[PDB]
A paper describes a structure:
As a step towards determining the means by which Grb7 SH2 recognizes its specific pY peptide substrates and the G7-18NATE peptide inhibitor we report the crystal structure of the human Grb7 SH2 domain to 2.1 Å resolution. The final Grb7 SH2 model consists of four protein chains each containing residues 420–532 of the human Grb7 protein, 181 water molecules and 7 sulphate anions, and has an R-factor of 20.1% (Rfree = 25.5 %). The monomer fold of the Grb7 SH2 domain is typical of the SH2 domain family, forming a βαβββββαβ configuration. The βF strand, observed in other SH2 domains, does not form in Grb7. We have shown that the Grb7 SH2 domain adopts the classic SH2 domain fold excepting, as also observed for Grb10 and Grb14 SH2 domains, an extension of the βD' and βE strands resulting in a longer DE loop. Although the BC loop within apo-SH2 domain structures usually exhibits poorly defined electron density, the Grb7 SH2 domain BC loop is well defined and closely resembles that of SH2 domains in their peptide bound conformation. The BC loop is held in this conformation by a complex network of hydrogen bond contacts formed with a sulphate anion that appears to mimic the phosphate moiety of the natural ligand. These contacts include a bidentate ionic interaction with the side-chain of the invariant Arg 458 (βB5). Analysis of the molecular surface of the Grb7 SH2 domain indicates that it lacks this classical +3 binding pocket. The Grb7 SH2 domain crystallised as a dimer, forming a dimerisation interface (between chains A and B and between chains C and D in the asymmetric unit) analogous to that observed for Grb10 and Grb14 domain structures.
Human growth factor receptor bound protein 7 (Grb7) is an adapter protein that mediates the coupling of tyrosine kinases with their downstream signaling pathways. Grb7 is frequently overexpressed in invasive and metastatic human cancers and is implicated in cancer progression via its interaction with the ErbB2 receptor and focal adhesion kinase (FAK) that play critical roles in cell proliferation and migration. Members of the Grb7 family share a conserved multi-domain structure comprising an N-terminal proline rich domain, a Ras-associating-like (RA) domain, a plekstrin homology (PH) domain, a C-terminal src-homology 2 (SH2) domain and a region between the PH and SH2 domains termed the BPS domain. The interaction with upstream tyrosine kinases is predominantly mediated by the SH2 domain, which recognizes specific phosphotyrosines.
Residue numbers in the entry:
A (entry chain C), B (entry chain A): 420 to 532
The structure:
């Protein structure tokens, strides 16, 4: 019912928050293996960062935009693996590791459901 | 690149926040006609609320789950107009007023961008 109501809302996305902020929020949600969020990058404000808990360590993956044949894509591996938006990136990594040490299993949010 | 990235993130959903906090956030973002958000009700554990600014006043429209014959829908008018989830409702009202005093024009984002 809640699940159904909010099924297509993307609670993993945090917008313009810091690296430190992401580690705090993740740290306080238990350092759960596979816990994650996406946010805007500080060091590169045109990009995004996937912040991911694995083995109680928090890791950050820079997501950069590029363009090819008039279409924009995002990549955290210098263009080897490409996505049309962050949602496609997140959905792919919920089932496949790719470069990551684990799946994206648990959304880290600051929303109360 | 941001709107290409956050395409399908549905930043209008805020989860459970008070009536006053909704009004605070709407005000903070400028009290534009058609500025809106969807939250969870503080009073009804299973209800949602569309909070929408028209003519410098915030109004609140309850969105309720209904289950008819093992099928779930959401509605703001006791099932005259039915929706599978919150996104369906929002997208319909971005184009059609329905029971509302204006269109849903501007997302009151749950995150800074």
């Amino acid at each position: 019912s809640l699940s159904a109501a909010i099924h297509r809302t993307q609670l993993w996305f945090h917008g313009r928050i810091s690296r430190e902020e992401s580690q705090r929020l993740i740290g306080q949600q238990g350092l759960v293996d596979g816990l994650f969020l996406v946010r805007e990058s500080q060091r590169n404000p045109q990009g995004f960062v996937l912040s991911l808990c694995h083995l109680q360590k928090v890791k950050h993956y820079l997501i950069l935009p590029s363009e090819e044949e008039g279409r924009l894509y995002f990549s955290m591996d210098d263009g080897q693996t490409r996505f049309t938006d962050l949602l496609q990136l997140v959905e792919f990594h919920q089932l496949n590791r790719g470069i990551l040490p684990c799946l994206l299993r648990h959304c880290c949010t600051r929303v109360a459901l």
